Amino acid sequence: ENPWLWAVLVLLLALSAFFSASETAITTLYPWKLKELAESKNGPFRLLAEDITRFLTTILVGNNLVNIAATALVTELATQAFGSAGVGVATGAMTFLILFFGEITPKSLAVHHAEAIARLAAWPIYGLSVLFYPVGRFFSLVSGGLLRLLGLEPRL
Amino acid sequence: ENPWLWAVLVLLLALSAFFSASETAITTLYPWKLKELAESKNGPFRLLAEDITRFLTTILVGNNLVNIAATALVTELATQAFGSAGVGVATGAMTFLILFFGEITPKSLAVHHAEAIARLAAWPIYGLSVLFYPVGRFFSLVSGGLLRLLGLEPRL
Numbered sequence: 001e002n003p004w005l006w007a008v009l010v011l012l013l014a015l016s017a018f019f020s021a022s023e024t025a026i027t028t029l030y031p032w033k034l035k036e037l038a039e040s041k042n043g044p045f046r047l048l049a050e051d052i053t054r055f056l057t058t059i060l061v062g063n064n065l066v067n068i069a070a071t072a073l074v075t076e077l078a079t080q081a082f083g084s085a086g087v088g089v090a091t092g093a094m095t096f097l098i099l100f101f102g103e104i105t106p107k108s109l110a111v112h113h114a115e116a117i118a119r120l121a122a123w124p125i126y127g128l129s130v131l132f133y134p135v136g137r138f139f140s141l142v143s144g145g146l147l148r149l150l151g152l153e154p155r156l
Numbered sequence: 157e158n159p160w161l162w163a164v165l166v167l168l169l170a171l172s173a174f175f176s177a178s179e180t181a182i183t184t185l186y187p188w189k190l191k192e193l194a195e196s197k198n199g200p201f202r203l204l205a206e207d208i209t210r211f212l213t214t215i216l217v218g219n220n221l222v223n224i225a226a227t228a229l230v231t232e233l234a235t236q237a238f239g240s241a242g243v244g245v246a247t248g249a250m251t252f253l254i255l256f257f258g259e260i261t262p263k264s265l266a267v268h269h270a271e272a273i274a275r276l277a278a279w280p281i282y283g284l285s286v287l288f289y290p291v292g293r294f295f296s297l298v299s300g301g302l303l304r305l306l307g308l309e310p311r312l
Protein backbone atom coordinates (compact mmCIF):
# COMPACT_ATOMS: atom_id res chain seq x y z
CA GLU A 1 0.00 0.00 0.00
CA ASN A 2 2.08 2.92 -1.38
CA PRO A 3 1.44 6.54 -0.23
CA TRP A 4 0.97 8.05 -3.66
CA LEU A 5 -1.66 5.39 -4.37
CA TRP A 6 -3.85 6.67 -1.57
CA ALA A 7 -3.35 10.25 -2.77
CA VAL A 8 -4.29 9.23 -6.32
CA LEU A 9 -7.41 7.61 -4.90
CA VAL A 10 -8.31 10.81 -3.06
CA LEU A 11 -7.63 13.00 -6.10
CA LEU A 12 -10.04 10.76 -8.00
CA LEU A 13 -12.87 10.97 -5.44
CA ALA A 14 -12.30 14.73 -5.43
CA LEU A 15 -12.67 14.74 -9.20
CA SER A 16 -15.92 12.75 -8.94
CA ALA A 17 -17.15 15.36 -6.46
CA PHE A 18 -16.02 18.13 -8.78
CA PHE A 19 -18.04 16.55 -11.58
CA SER A 20 -21.19 15.74 -9.66
CA ALA A 21 -21.12 19.20 -8.05
CA SER A 22 -20.65 21.01 -11.36
CA GLU A 23 -23.44 18.96 -12.92
CA THR A 24 -25.80 20.12 -10.17
CA ALA A 25 -24.64 23.74 -10.20
CA ILE A 26 -25.06 23.99 -13.98
CA THR A 27 -28.54 22.50 -14.17
CA THR A 28 -30.07 24.36 -11.24
CA LEU A 29 -28.90 27.63 -12.83
CA TYR A 30 -30.41 26.68 -16.23
CA PRO A 31 -32.00 28.25 -18.09
CA TRP A 32 -33.26 31.62 -16.81
CA LYS A 33 -30.54 32.46 -14.24
CA LEU A 34 -27.87 31.01 -16.55
CA LYS A 35 -29.05 33.34 -19.33
CA GLU A 36 -29.11 36.22 -16.84
CA LEU A 37 -25.51 35.56 -15.79
CA ALA A 38 -24.65 35.06 -19.48
CA GLU A 39 -25.81 38.46 -20.78
CA SER A 40 -23.81 39.92 -17.94
CA LYS A 41 -20.06 39.32 -18.30
CA ASN A 42 -17.54 37.78 -17.71
CA GLY A 43 -17.38 35.11 -18.63
CA PRO A 44 -17.88 31.37 -18.11
CA PHE A 45 -21.66 31.64 -17.83
CA ARG A 46 -21.94 32.58 -21.50
CA LEU A 47 -20.05 29.42 -22.46
CA LEU A 48 -22.24 27.27 -20.17
CA ALA A 49 -25.51 28.71 -21.53
CA GLU A 50 -24.59 28.51 -25.18
CA ASP A 51 -23.43 24.85 -25.39
CA ILE A 52 -24.78 23.17 -22.33
CA THR A 53 -24.88 19.61 -23.69
CA ARG A 54 -21.15 19.89 -24.35
CA PHE A 55 -20.80 20.47 -20.62
CA LEU A 56 -23.17 17.87 -19.15
CA THR A 57 -21.70 15.27 -21.53
CA THR A 58 -18.09 15.79 -20.50
CA ILE A 59 -19.28 15.50 -16.93
CA LEU A 60 -21.09 12.20 -17.46
CA VAL A 61 -17.89 10.89 -19.08
CA GLY A 62 -15.57 12.45 -16.52
CA ASN A 63 -17.72 11.25 -13.60
CA ASN A 64 -17.97 7.60 -14.73
CA LEU A 65 -14.30 7.54 -15.74
CA VAL A 66 -12.91 8.59 -12.38
CA ASN A 67 -15.58 6.66 -10.51
CA ILE A 68 -14.67 3.44 -12.33
CA ALA A 69 -10.97 4.34 -12.21
CA ALA A 70 -10.99 4.82 -8.44
CA THR A 71 -13.00 1.62 -7.87
CA ALA A 72 -10.59 -0.33 -10.11
CA LEU A 73 -7.69 1.04 -8.11
CA VAL A 74 -9.19 0.13 -4.74
CA THR A 75 -10.14 -3.34 -5.98
CA GLU A 76 -6.48 -3.96 -6.80
CA LEU A 77 -5.56 -3.19 -3.20
CA ALA A 78 -8.55 -5.10 -1.85
CA THR A 79 -7.65 -8.19 -3.87
CA GLN A 80 -3.90 -7.99 -3.28
CA ALA A 81 -4.59 -7.89 0.47
CA PHE A 82 -7.65 -10.14 0.85
CA GLY A 83 -7.84 -12.35 -2.22
CA SER A 84 -11.28 -12.87 -3.74
CA ALA A 85 -12.87 -11.24 -0.71
CA GLY A 86 -11.36 -7.94 -1.81
CA VAL A 87 -14.04 -7.64 -4.49
CA GLY A 88 -16.58 -7.77 -1.68
CA VAL A 89 -14.59 -5.30 0.41
CA ALA A 90 -13.97 -2.84 -2.43
CA THR A 91 -17.58 -2.87 -3.64
CA GLY A 92 -18.73 -2.03 -0.12
CA ALA A 93 -16.00 0.51 0.67
CA MET A 94 -16.34 2.21 -2.70
CA THR A 95 -20.17 2.19 -2.88
CA PHE A 96 -19.95 4.13 0.37
CA LEU A 97 -17.26 6.49 -0.94
CA ILE A 98 -18.67 7.42 -4.33
CA LEU A 99 -22.19 7.79 -2.89
CA PHE A 100 -21.21 9.91 0.13
CA PHE A 101 -18.13 11.78 -1.09
CA GLY A 102 -18.49 11.70 -4.87
CA GLU A 103 -22.31 12.28 -5.14
CA ILE A 104 -24.55 12.92 -2.12
CA THR A 105 -22.27 15.46 -0.44
CA PRO A 106 -21.26 17.42 -3.60
CA LYS A 107 -24.79 17.54 -5.00
CA SER A 108 -26.10 18.65 -1.62
CA LEU A 109 -23.32 21.28 -1.57
CA ALA A 110 -23.90 22.63 -5.06
CA VAL A 111 -27.53 23.86 -4.77
CA HIS A 112 -26.32 26.29 -2.12
CA HIS A 113 -23.47 27.65 -4.28
CA ALA A 114 -24.48 27.27 -7.92
CA GLU A 115 -23.06 30.51 -9.29
CA ALA A 116 -19.58 30.21 -7.77
CA ILE A 117 -19.13 26.54 -8.67
CA ALA A 118 -20.43 27.04 -12.22
CA ARG A 119 -18.08 29.98 -12.70
CA LEU A 120 -15.14 27.98 -11.36
CA ALA A 121 -15.78 24.76 -13.26
CA ALA A 122 -16.73 25.97 -16.73
CA TRP A 123 -13.21 26.44 -18.08
CA PRO A 124 -11.76 23.19 -16.60
CA ILE A 125 -14.73 21.23 -17.93
CA TYR A 126 -14.59 23.10 -21.23
CA GLY A 127 -11.00 21.89 -21.44
CA LEU A 128 -11.84 18.27 -20.68
CA SER A 129 -14.58 18.66 -23.31
CA VAL A 130 -12.04 18.90 -26.18
CA LEU A 131 -11.77 15.13 -25.85
CA PHE A 132 -14.76 13.86 -23.83
CA TYR A 133 -17.61 15.51 -25.73
CA PRO A 134 -16.74 13.80 -29.08
CA VAL A 135 -16.38 10.48 -27.22
CA GLY A 136 -19.75 10.90 -25.49
CA ARG A 137 -21.39 12.26 -28.66
CA PHE A 138 -19.98 9.34 -30.65
CA PHE A 139 -21.19 6.83 -28.06
CA SER A 140 -24.69 8.28 -28.29
CA LEU A 141 -24.92 8.38 -32.10
CA VAL A 142 -23.90 4.72 -32.23
CA SER A 143 -26.20 4.00 -29.29
CA GLY A 144 -29.22 5.43 -31.10
CA GLY A 145 -27.98 3.78 -34.24
CA LEU A 146 -27.90 0.39 -32.51
CA LEU A 147 -31.38 1.14 -31.17
CA ARG A 148 -33.09 1.93 -34.47
CA LEU A 149 -31.61 -1.06 -36.31
CA LEU A 150 -33.12 -3.06 -33.41
CA GLY A 151 -36.54 -1.45 -33.83
CA LEU A 152 -36.60 -0.12 -30.30
CA GLU A 153 -36.74 3.47 -31.58
CA PRO A 154 -38.72 5.19 -34.36
CA ARG A 155 -37.14 4.32 -37.69
CA LEU A 156 -34.73 6.66 -39.48
CA GLU B 157 -12.05 -16.92 -16.20
CA ASN B 158 -15.12 -18.92 -15.04
CA PRO B 159 -18.38 -18.91 -17.09
CA TRP B 160 -20.69 -17.83 -14.29
CA LEU B 161 -18.39 -14.87 -13.65
CA TRP B 162 -19.06 -13.48 -17.11
CA ALA B 163 -22.80 -14.05 -16.64
CA VAL B 164 -22.69 -12.25 -13.29
CA LEU B 165 -20.92 -9.39 -15.01
CA VAL B 166 -23.62 -9.24 -17.67
CA LEU B 167 -26.45 -9.43 -15.12
CA LEU B 168 -24.82 -6.45 -13.40
CA LEU B 169 -24.54 -4.30 -16.54
CA ALA B 170 -28.16 -5.22 -17.25
CA LEU B 171 -29.09 -4.02 -13.77
CA SER B 172 -27.23 -0.74 -14.36
CA ALA B 173 -29.23 -0.35 -17.57
CA PHE B 174 -32.42 -1.19 -15.72
CA PHE B 175 -31.63 1.54 -13.20
CA SER B 176 -30.53 4.24 -15.59
CA ALA B 177 -33.50 3.49 -17.86
CA SER B 178 -36.02 3.59 -15.02
CA GLU B 179 -34.53 6.84 -13.76
CA THR B 180 -35.10 8.40 -17.18
CA ALA B 181 -38.57 6.94 -17.67
CA ILE B 182 -39.73 8.16 -14.26
CA THR B 183 -38.48 11.72 -14.57
CA THR B 184 -39.65 12.38 -18.12
CA LEU B 185 -43.15 11.27 -17.06
CA TYR B 186 -43.10 13.59 -13.99
CA PRO B 187 -45.13 15.39 -12.96
CA TRP B 188 -48.16 16.00 -15.22
CA LYS B 189 -48.24 12.71 -17.19
CA LEU B 190 -47.27 10.77 -14.05
CA LYS B 191 -50.25 12.31 -12.21
CA GLU B 192 -52.45 11.53 -15.22
CA LEU B 193 -51.41 7.88 -15.21
CA ALA B 194 -51.77 7.90 -11.41
CA GLU B 195 -55.42 8.98 -11.21
CA SER B 196 -56.08 6.27 -13.74
CA LYS B 197 -55.42 2.77 -12.38
CA ASN B 198 -53.67 0.35 -11.99
CA GLY B 199 -51.29 0.66 -10.49
CA PRO B 200 -47.56 1.38 -10.28
CA PHE B 201 -47.92 4.96 -11.50
CA ARG B 202 -49.72 5.96 -8.30
CA LEU B 203 -46.80 4.65 -6.25
CA LEU B 204 -44.27 6.47 -8.46
CA ALA B 205 -46.12 9.80 -8.27
CA GLU B 206 -46.76 9.74 -4.55
CA ASP B 207 -43.20 9.02 -3.27
CA ILE B 208 -40.91 9.81 -6.11
CA THR B 209 -37.79 10.56 -4.06
CA ARG B 210 -38.05 7.06 -2.61
CA PHE B 211 -37.71 5.84 -6.18
CA LEU B 212 -34.94 8.06 -7.56
CA THR B 213 -32.92 7.42 -4.38
CA THR B 214 -33.02 3.63 -4.61
CA ILE B 215 -31.94 4.03 -8.20
CA LEU B 216 -28.94 6.22 -7.41
CA VAL B 217 -27.92 3.61 -4.83
CA GLY B 218 -28.73 0.64 -7.04
CA ASN B 219 -26.97 2.19 -10.04
CA ASN B 220 -23.71 3.04 -8.22
CA LEU B 221 -23.72 -0.29 -6.38
CA VAL B 222 -23.88 -2.49 -9.47
CA ASN B 223 -21.68 -0.13 -11.44
CA ILE B 224 -18.95 -0.29 -8.79
CA ALA B 225 -19.64 -3.99 -8.22
CA ALA B 226 -19.21 -4.85 -11.90
CA THR B 227 -16.05 -2.73 -12.20
CA ALA B 228 -14.59 -4.37 -9.08
CA LEU B 229 -15.32 -7.77 -10.59
CA VAL B 230 -13.70 -6.97 -13.93
CA THR B 231 -10.66 -5.44 -12.21
CA GLU B 232 -10.11 -8.75 -10.44
CA LEU B 233 -9.95 -10.51 -13.79
CA ALA B 234 -7.90 -7.72 -15.35
CA THR B 235 -5.35 -7.85 -12.54
CA GLN B 236 -5.24 -11.64 -12.26
CA ALA B 237 -4.48 -11.81 -15.99
CA PHE B 238 -2.34 -8.71 -16.57
CA GLY B 239 -0.93 -7.62 -13.23
CA SER B 240 -0.93 -3.90 -12.49
CA ALA B 241 -1.86 -3.18 -16.10
CA GLY B 242 -5.26 -4.73 -15.43
CA VAL B 243 -6.31 -1.56 -13.60
CA GLY B 244 -5.62 0.29 -16.84
CA VAL B 245 -7.43 -2.34 -18.89
CA ALA B 246 -10.47 -2.55 -16.60
CA THR B 247 -10.89 1.22 -16.31
CA GLY B 248 -10.91 1.47 -20.10
CA ALA B 249 -13.07 -1.60 -20.75
CA MET B 250 -15.54 -0.69 -18.03
CA THR B 251 -15.72 3.07 -18.75
CA PHE B 252 -16.82 1.95 -22.21
CA LEU B 253 -19.31 -0.60 -20.86
CA ILE B 254 -21.08 1.43 -18.18
CA LEU B 255 -21.24 4.49 -20.47
CA PHE B 256 -22.55 2.66 -23.56
CA PHE B 257 -24.52 -0.24 -22.09
CA GLY B 258 -25.35 0.97 -18.58
CA GLU B 259 -26.14 4.67 -19.37
CA ILE B 260 -26.14 6.11 -22.89
CA THR B 261 -28.11 3.28 -24.50
CA PRO B 262 -30.72 2.81 -21.71
CA LYS B 263 -31.32 6.53 -21.26
CA SER B 264 -31.65 6.94 -25.01
CA LEU B 265 -34.07 3.99 -24.98
CA ALA B 266 -36.24 5.19 -22.11
CA VAL B 267 -37.51 8.53 -23.52
CA HIS B 268 -39.19 6.53 -26.28
CA HIS B 269 -40.90 4.11 -23.86
CA ALA B 270 -41.44 5.93 -20.57
CA GLU B 271 -44.85 4.54 -19.66
CA ALA B 272 -44.05 0.86 -20.20
CA ILE B 273 -40.68 0.98 -18.42
CA ALA B 274 -42.07 2.98 -15.49
CA ARG B 275 -44.93 0.52 -15.13
CA LEU B 276 -42.55 -2.43 -15.26
CA ALA B 277 -39.91 -1.08 -12.90
CA ALA B 278 -41.95 0.49 -10.11
CA TRP B 279 -42.58 -2.67 -8.10
CA PRO B 280 -39.01 -4.09 -8.44
CA ILE B 281 -37.55 -0.72 -7.45
CA TYR B 282 -40.14 -0.31 -4.70
CA GLY B 283 -38.87 -3.62 -3.38
CA LEU B 284 -35.20 -2.62 -3.50
CA SER B 285 -36.33 0.58 -1.76
CA VAL B 286 -37.14 -1.28 1.51
CA LEU B 287 -33.39 -1.25 2.10
CA PHE B 288 -31.80 1.33 -0.24
CA TYR B 289 -33.98 4.35 0.51
CA PRO B 290 -33.07 4.42 4.26
CA VAL B 291 -29.40 3.99 3.33
CA GLY B 292 -29.54 6.83 0.79
CA ARG B 293 -31.68 8.99 3.10
CA PHE B 294 -29.26 8.34 5.97
CA PHE B 295 -26.27 9.19 3.78
CA SER B 296 -27.88 12.50 2.85
CA LEU B 297 -28.89 13.55 6.37
CA VAL B 298 -25.32 12.94 7.55
CA SER B 299 -24.03 14.60 4.38
CA GLY B 300 -25.97 17.79 5.06
CA GLY B 301 -25.06 17.44 8.69
CA LEU B 302 -21.36 17.31 7.82
CA LEU B 303 -21.92 20.32 5.56
CA ARG B 304 -23.54 22.63 8.10
CA LEU B 305 -21.02 21.89 10.86
CA LEU B 306 -18.45 22.91 8.20
CA GLY B 307 -20.26 26.16 7.42
CA LEU B 308 -20.71 25.32 3.77
CA GLU B 309 -24.51 25.38 4.16
CA PRO B 310 -26.92 27.75 5.93
CA ARG B 311 -26.81 27.04 9.65
CA LEU B 312 -29.39 24.88 11.40
Ligand SMILES: [Mg+2]
Binds near residue numbers: 015018103
Ligand atom coordinates in the same frame (compact mmCIF):
# COMPACT_ATOMS: atom_id res chain seq x y z
MG1 LIG C 1 -19.22 12.28 -8.73
Ligand SMILES: [Mg+2]
Binds near residue numbers: 174176258259
Ligand atom coordinates in the same frame (compact mmCIF):
# COMPACT_ATOMS: atom_id res chain seq x y z
MG1 LIG D 1 -26.87 2.47 -15.24
Ligand SMILES: [Zn+2]
Binds near residue numbers: 036039
Ligand atom coordinates in the same frame (compact mmCIF):
# COMPACT_ATOMS: atom_id res chain seq x y z
ZN1 LIG E 1 -31.01 40.48 -17.85
Ligand SMILES: [Zn+2]
Binds near residue numbers: 192195
Ligand atom coordinates in the same frame (compact mmCIF):
# COMPACT_ATOMS: atom_id res chain seq x y z
ZN1 LIG F 1 -56.91 13.19 -15.66
